[PDB]
Amino acid sequence: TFVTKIFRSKDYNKLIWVFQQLFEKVEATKPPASRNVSAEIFVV
RNA sequence: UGAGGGCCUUGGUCACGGCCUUGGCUUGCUACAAUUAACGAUCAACUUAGAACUGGUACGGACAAGGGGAAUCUGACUGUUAACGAG
Structure with missing residues (x-):
């Protein structure tokens, strides 16, 4: 299981897709x- | 073929006109046709009901009340990153 913290921005959906x-x-x-x-x- | 009317006429009768008698259009009874009168004639009845000019339709072309979008936390809580709340 990969648990990470992301700063929400315009490039947030691409990380979710990956x-x-x-x-x-x-x-x-x-x-x-x-x-x-x-x-x-x-x-x- | 019988009746009634019209024009004729013949004698007697009463002062052209009456009275009494003499012989030649309507209707009645019978005989053969017609019965598609399923026709015709006449008298009497009869006049033109229409008004009004309302809208919604499907289509073609611009307005329509008004800054939008996504995801999490959270509140009552179904059959897909479900949905819902002017949180």
């Missing part, structure tokens, strides 16, 4: 520990 290519299920989330103001998103 992960879907290499992984059977790809899903992103934002844990409450990460501050809401931050643009980071944790995708597994």
Whole structure:
């Protein structure tokens, strides 16, 4: 399982597509520990 | 073939006109046709109902209330990155 943090931007969907290519299920989330103001998103 | 009318006429009768008698168009009864009168004639009845000029239709061409898009956290919670909330 690959768990990474991505800064949301215009190049965020391409990473998701590549992960879907290499992984059977790809899903992103934002844990409450990460501050809401931050643009980071944790995708597994 | 019988009746009634019209024009004739013959004698007697009463002062051209009456009275009494003499012989030659309508209808009645019989005989043969017609019965597609399924025709014709006449008297009486009869006048032209139409108004109004409303819209929705499918089509062809511009407006229509108004800054949009995606994903996560979250709240009540089905059969696909489900959906829903003017969070």
